[PDB]
């Protein structure tokens, strides 16, 4: 798996591949790894499908009640906290690598990382999953402060493309999603749409 | 669970539920006992020989162990309970300790059971 999220002024961009394997067999080459937690909050999942699915439903339930009870749009930081609470509390029984990104009427666009241990940290952009190891150097040399919902949306497309290229545990189609006050728009990049890089020859 | 306090003290220091229990004992078939030196005896009075009855299934005399036995007077159903509880304690006094049950020990046990039931909620 390879997940990633980037923060841009009025919103966020989210990307993930669609590969979910059991061993070396792809049980789903079209998985949807970007899960809606609330109207304008999303999370990217890596790790145990059963664990990330079960945890996300739990947070969605928790958050949905919290907002109706307050009659207000929930904070992105809150959604992150609810994942962090479950992921820290049950860290010995879960295998979840999560990234929470979304828009906040109070804090705007934000991205939080909640890796294996259960820790939580806010970042300009985050990357997770097996494939993430192959795109650190890339991402470090490419990330620019002040990118646009477009530059960003393209920046993750390259990073996910590169990672999908080298990691067996990653591949398929690239799913994206941009969130900003206006709302959420999700697109997909099949075959040719996926950035390409020529395999070195003679 | 039912926690009401059933037996309580009264203005002058009485425990009516006990005094009432004692009354039920009074309305029971007389029972006497004499201590000899080679044989102790016991007899149960007013056995209301309805004849259509069946001797065995109602003898107010029972054995608890192989060295002890007892007679009672009062509410029939209660006696049963207490009888079979002492019976159990008899065999259990042999599993914890190895020696058998004493004359007094078992009696004390029964007294302790009754006393408890005059100071426990719900009973």
């Amino acid at each position: 798996t390879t997940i990633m999220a980037v923060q841009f002024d009025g919103g966020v961009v989210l990307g993930a591949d669609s590969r979910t394997t059991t061993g070396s067999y792809i049980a789903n080459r079209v998985t949807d790894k970007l899960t809606p937690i609330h109207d304008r909050i999303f999370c990217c999942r890596s790790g145990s499908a059963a664990d990330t699915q079960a945890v996300a439903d739990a947070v969605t339930y928790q958050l949905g009640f919290h907002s109706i009870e307050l009659n207000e749009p929930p904070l992105v930081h809150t959604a992150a906290s609810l994942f962090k609470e479950m992921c820290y509390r049950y860290r010995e029984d879960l295998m979840a690598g999560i990234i929470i990104a979304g828009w906040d009427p109070q804090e705007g666009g934000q991205v939080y990382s909640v890796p294996m241990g259960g820790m939580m940290v806010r970042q300009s952009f985050a990357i997770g999953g097996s494939g993430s190891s192959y795109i650190y150097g890339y991402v470090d040399a490419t990330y620019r402060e002040g990118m646009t919902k477009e530059e960003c949306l393209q920046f993750t497309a390259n990073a996910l493309a590169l990672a999908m290229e080298r990691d067996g545990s990653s591949g398929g189609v690239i799913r994206l999603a941009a969130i900003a006050e206006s709302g959420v728009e999700r697109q997909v990049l099949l075959g040719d749409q996926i950035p390409k890089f020529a395999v070195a020859t003679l | 669970s039912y926690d009401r306090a059933i037996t309580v003290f009264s203005p002058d220091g009485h425990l009516f539920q006990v005094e009432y229990a004692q009354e039920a004992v009074k309305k029971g078939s007389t029972a006497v006992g004499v201590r000899g030196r080679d044989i102790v005896v016991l007899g149960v009075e007013k056995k209301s020989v309805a004849k259509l009855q069946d001797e065995r299934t109602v003898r107010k005399i029972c054995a608890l162990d192989d060295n002890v036995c007892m007679a009672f007077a009062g509410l029939t159903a209660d006696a049963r309970i207490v009888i079979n509880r002492a019976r159990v304690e008899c065999q259990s006094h042999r599993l914890t300790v190895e020696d058998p049950v004493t004359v007094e020990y078992i009696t004390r046990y029964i007294a302790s059971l009754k006393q408890r039931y005059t100071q426990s909620n719900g009973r």
């Binding site: - | 019976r87 259990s92 042999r94």
Partner: protein, 199 residues
């Protein structure tokens, strides 16, 4: 290592056990008794692990006795065997399983003599004759060889005598004396120990 044997006749049941309480390389007790009195016509021959034997045996014991005090009449040897089997089998998958192997010999003034064998797993079987322990391996063939559904207690004590001598011969465990007892319409009768002239 503990040995138990029982032979059912047409009107009685003869049973025997060794009297050694082993520990490490030494016999710690010269006169150990593997039999337990349950009723006036019932015995429970019990062998196994250090605490499990006594604890369990006495437990089934006092519970059979309790039955006597509660109903006036005793349990039939057949009913006791299924009782003890129920408990042992119920503790098998508990926190307190009992690791014991046993024989239940009894006489019913209506059913006759009965000998029951039981696995520490609580498998229950009725049988004309049976044994427990390594000794069983060296002696069950003898019984198959000389046992007849009509053997009289004179014969039986002789068949037993044979098995017992075999252990003095092939078995590598000391085992000098063996408690012996019979059960018939008149209850549980002792018998002299079968002993062997070793220092």
């Amino acid at each position: 290592m503990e040995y138990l044997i029982g032979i059912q006749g047409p009107d009685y049941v003869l049973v025997a056990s060794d009297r050694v309480a082993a520990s490490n390389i030494v016999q710690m007790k010269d006169d150990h008794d593997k039999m337990f009195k349950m009723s006036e016509k019932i015995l429970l021959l019990c062998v196994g692990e250090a605490g499990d034997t006594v604890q369990f045996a006495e437990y089934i014991q006092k519970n059979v006795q309790l039955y006597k005090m509660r109903n006036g009449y005793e349990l039939s040897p057949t009913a006791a065997a299924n009782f003890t089997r129920r408990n042992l089998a119920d503790c098998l998958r508990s926190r307190t399983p009992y690791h014991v192997n046993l024989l239940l010999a009894g006489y019913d003034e209506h059913e006759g003599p009965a000998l029951y064998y039981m696995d520490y797993l609580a498998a229950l079987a009725k049988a004309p004759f049976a044994a427990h322990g390594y000794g069983a391996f060296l002696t069950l063939s003898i019984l198959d060889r000389y046992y007849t559904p009509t053997i009289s207690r004179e014969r039986a004590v002789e068949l037993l005598r044979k098995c017992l001598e075999e252990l003095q011969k092939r078995f590598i465990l000391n085992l000098p004396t063996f408690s012996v007892r019979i059960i018939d319409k008149n209850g549980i009768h002792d018998l002299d120990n079968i002993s062997f002239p070793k220092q």
